[PDB]
Design a protein around this ligand. Structure first.
Ligand code: HEC
Ligand code: HEC
Ligand code: HEC
Ligand code: HEC
Ligand code: HEC
Ligand code: HEC
Ligand code: HEC
Ligand code: HEC
Ligand code: HEC
Ligand code: HEC
Ligand code: HEC
Ligand code: HEC
Ligand code: HEC
Ligand code: HEC
Lengths: 292, 292
């Protein structure tokens, strides 16, 4: 028993290596990337969405580490991670691994609520989602991979081993977070906001529970907490918004909204991002009843 | 157990809690911080340097989480982490935990070379260097520290268990990195640069091998490699500078220096930061001899 074959004829899973002309005898590089061609080709209908030149060929044939004429000196690095890709007035607009994943988060309603307010860390755990080779790869295979003298038979074995060894990280249950939270730090013109904490988290999670792209990148058990509880270590008891966001203006931290704007911008930000019908940003009592 | 008594009378080590107005029954907060008064007072001479209002009292007496008139509304968060602190005309210019530590890396020659070119990540591992309590602390104890009803002997106990469980990360030996590196990616007007890789690393580590501040914050075995090999997952075989820095200016990545500038800015940046006498920025042939 092996990986399921593709309709396209491309290998089901593929190790991608840092291909360039320059010798790399010490194997100075990121871990290589195992790309699952099978699941991507099933999800994305047009081959040439990715194979933007119409050549059903490895990107690295034109995009090398240093760059070359066949790819107009757009490097491997650029081709795989580019985020600011200009629309092409004629013919195909290329995509990168990173730009397409990001477009997914902006374009799909079930993703665009959280992703309207998340700021991604882009840390080691992020890189490792792709830079993910199996440990059984040898330095020798690495050189061969780098030199392009690896046999596809060996490439595919390494790739199937990695894929078969992958395990999806389970998000913690919303049962381990508060049922409700009475937000009353600022209560004055209005009553406290009775935020449906667990209802909200449960709902957001259910809409993405089987998404393979979300599952790969949502890769620490408490990472979804950080959607709102941002910029602090993942934890089942994060610090309060009011620890960092002051009630009055904080000249020392102009990037920081004051605490009322913090709640408004975050709550309303998601609501707008995934087109919540109620409450509207102009509805001033649904989130907090007027005080008597 | 107990730790070495101080000359000053302050407890040797102290648990600091998120002290403020409003009730926090769930302990929604960062881990408390255990401050080692002993080592600090043996290094910083004047008490007023820290206890900027003279009388040595807990900072959160004036700097609460929410902030109050007694601290000019400067919150606990600002008090502990402030980096943008104005020279005080009259009297004492206050310091923060973060600001003093930053000053050290800038004012000590043995630190200012590396720290002239590193950009700190300020990630979880950074936070945890101070937010560091022993797991033996109980919710209940958390509540008492927050409400200010925890017994001093109980505070002292907590801190001592924490301090006595602490461990230092030992950096990887320079024997696990290249002895020398022939930097030839751009070789043209000049011969390659025969970089004394292990000697540079070994020399830099030597000057800081006892330093307790560096030891706490250099808290991954391969983190010192990141001084130069930045912005990639820690590894004994980091990618080449060239993978990310293009020979010519990346118009897609305007902020990125091109490869020659990367080298020049990095090598000369440190040299200047720790006043290296030679090579000067103008001693071109000292880093790369003129080509035949
Ligand atoms: C983006 C989501 C892709 C879609 C849609 C399709 N392909 Fe692809 N393919 C993609 C990548 C990132 C790569 C490069 C992997 C590498 O080895 O460097 C590939 C590779 C191929 C290849 C080359 C096989 C190899 O050299 O090992 C073939 C033959 C190929 N893909 C063809 C192909 C076809 C026919 C597709 C539509 C049915 C198709 N791909 C979709 C990314 C993507
Ligand atoms: C040679 C036959 C190529 C192959 C195979 C792949 N790409 Fe390519 N890429 C190529 C050129 C000549 C160009 C410039 C086209 C233009 O409109 O100017 C590009 C550019 C890209 C880009 C855009 C970069 C930017 O605009 O900043 C990306 C992101 C890109 N290429 C990615 C990419 C991927 C993922 C490929 C494999 C699936 C791939 N290219 C193959 C030439 C060639
Ligand atoms: C859109 C045109 C994409 C491009 C280009 C790339 N990826 Fe992607 N990826 C995309 C989708 C829509 C999905 C989910 C598929 C599904 O069945 O829902 C994914 C998923 C991934 C994953 C997670 C699945 C896994 O194999 O673990 C990874 C790690 C991944 N994608 C990597 C990846 C790389 C390395 C790419 C460039 C070579 C890349 N993707 C391009 C959409 C698109
Ligand atoms: C809130 C409950 C979320 C929902 C629903 C979705 N995403 Fe998410 N995502 C969330 C967080 C808090 C994070 C971590 C931020 C960080 O520091 O990295 C992420 C991260 C991702 C990523 C990686 C970061 C990026 O590239 O932007 C990807 C690719 C991603 N998320 C995809 C994704 C998709 C496709 C979703 C809808 C199916 C989706 N997520 C929903 C939080 C939440
Ligand atoms: C936004 C959609 C959130 C997500 C996802 C999670 N939390 Fe949350 N939580 C959120 C808010 C706006 C608040 C109020 C904070 C304030 O200072 O006003 C909270 C509160 C908590 C608390 C504190 C409860 C209390 O009684 O004070 C805890 C312990 C908490 N949140 C935990 C938590 C965890 C573990 C999460 C991921 C599973 C999580 N939160 C998700 C908003 C959001
Ligand atoms: C300190 C550890 C923080 C806690 C706790 C929370 N936030 Fe925050 N937030 C913080 C910073 C440093 C910044 C400024 C970012 C910058 O670089 O400018 C912010 C910013 C916001 C924003 C603006 C949009 C954004 O960049 O995310 C909002 C809407 C916001 N903060 C809201 C918010 C809420 C509601 C929180 C409790 C759940 C919260 N933040 C916690 C630092 C910290
Ligand atoms: C949910 C999506 C909200 C909407 C829509 C509005 N507000 Fe809001 N508001 C929200 C929270 C979570 C909080 C914090 C509650 C607390 O007491 O700490 C607030 C706060 C305010 C406040 C300050 C608190 C008070 O005076 O009671 C004011 C003055 C306020 N909100 C004004 C306001 C108006 C005018 C709105 C309609 C445009 C409105 N809020 C919407 C959440 C949400
Ligand atoms: C030592 C140099 C610290 C580093 C590094 C960081 N913090 Fe800190 N923080 C420090 C102290 C002495 C205190 C007071 C004691 C306490 O635990 O309250 C704090 C306090 C906070 C707070 C406010 C209290 C709370 O809500 O728990 C926050 C929100 C906080 N610290 C956050 C924080 C984060 C996210 C850090 C890494 C980015 C971080 N601190 C670094 C000292 C030190
Ligand atoms: C900064 C490097 C300091 C120097 C120099 C000195 N002290 Fe200190 N002290 C400092 C901190 C961060 C704290 C706060 C602890 C807390 O719980 O908030 C303390 C604590 C004390 C105390 C205890 C006060 C109390 O907790 O009620 C005393 C009595 C004290 N410090 C005295 C003191 C003297 C006399 C010093 C000079 C010889 C001195 N401190 C140096 C920070 C720093
Ligand atoms: C200068 C005026 C400082 C202020 C204010 C604070 N710290 Fe500090 N820190 C300072 C020095 C010079 C040293 C090393 C002293 C030596 O013996 O060489 C340190 C050390 C630390 C450490 C690491 C050692 C340890 O105790 O684990 C930590 C974790 C630390 N400092 C924490 C800390 C906190 C929490 C502070 C604010 C409450 C704080 N420091 C103030 C110099 C100065
Ligand atoms: C190069 C060999 C270094 C020397 C010599 C010193 N430091 Fe360092 N330090 C270095 C790196 C690569 C990092 C990691 C940055 C990150 O991403 O966290 C650090 C980090 C620190 C920190 C933490 C960040 C900060 O608050 O600035 C501190 C406090 C620190 N280093 C202290 C320090 C001191 C006091 C030094 C001289 C005795 C010193 N550094 C030397 C690299 C190197
Ligand atoms: C060490 C501190 C240096 C000093 C002083 C100067 N240069 Fe440099 N330069 C350095 C390195 C590590 C490299 C990369 C070497 C390689 O082959 O990759 C360079 C590169 C150059 C180059 C390009 C390579 C070549 O043409 O051979 C040029 C044009 C260059 N450096 C010029 C230059 C001049 C004029 C300097 C004095 C004013 C100078 N460099 C200083 C390291 C160092
Ligand atoms: C700056 C003072 C550095 C520190 C600290 C470390 N390295 Fe380094 N390294 C540095 C340069 C300028 C280069 C040249 C890379 C290039 O692309 O031009 C290197 C090179 C390496 C290499 C590759 C050498 C080869 O023959 O290919 C490796 C494997 C390497 N470095 C590893 C390494 C490790 C593990 C380090 C910490 C223990 C480390 N280096 C630190 C500059 C600096
Ligand atoms: C991609 C994974 C990189 C590798 C490998 C190296 N560098 Fe880098 N460098 C990178 C980025 C994305 C940036 C821009 C950050 C910004 O704020 O714009 C930089 C920046 C530099 C600089 C300028 C100062 C700085 O911000 O650090 C220098 C001097 C530099 N890079 C040099 C450098 C060298 C010599 C490298 C090999 C040892 C190297 N970088 C690797 C990303 C990446």
């Amino acid at each position: 028993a092996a990986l399921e074959p593709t309709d396209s004829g491309a290998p089901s899973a593929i190790v991608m290596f840092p291909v360039g002309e320059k010798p790399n005898p010490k194997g100075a590089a990121m871990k290589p990337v195992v790309f699952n061609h099978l699941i991507h080709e099933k999800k994305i209908d047009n081959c040439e969405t990715c194979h933007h030149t119409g050549d059903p060929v490895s990107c690295s044939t034109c995009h090398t580490v240093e760059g070359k004429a066949e790819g107009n000196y757009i490097t491997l690095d650029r081709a795989m991670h580019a985020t600011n890709i200009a629309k092409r007035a004629k013919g195909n607009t290329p995509v990168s691994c990173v730009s397409c994943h990001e477009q997914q988060t902006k374009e799909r309603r079930e993703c665009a609520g959280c992703h309207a307010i998340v700021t991604p860390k882009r840390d080691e755990a992020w890189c490792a989602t792709c830079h993910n080779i199996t440990p059984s790869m040898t330095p020798e295979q690495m050189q061969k991979g780098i030199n392009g003298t690896l046999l596809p038979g060996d490439n595919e074995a390494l790739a199937a081993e990695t894929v078969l060894a992958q395990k999806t990280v389970e998000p913690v249950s919303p049962m381990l977070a508060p049922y409700k939270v009475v937000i009353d730090a600022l209560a004055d013109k209005y009553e406290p906001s009775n935020f449906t904490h667990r209802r909200h988290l449960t709902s957001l999670m259910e809409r993405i529970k089987d998404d393979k792209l979300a599952q790969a990148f949502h890769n620490k058990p408490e990472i979804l907490c950080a959607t709102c509880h941002h910029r602090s270590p993942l934890s089942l008891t994060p610090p309060k918004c009011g620890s960092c966001h002051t009630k009055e203006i904080d000249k020392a931290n102009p990037g920081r909204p004051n605490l009322m704007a913090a709640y408004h911008l975050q709550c309303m930000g998601c609501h707008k991002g995934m087109d919540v019908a109620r409450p509207r940003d102009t509805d001033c009592t649904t989130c907090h009843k007027a005080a008597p």
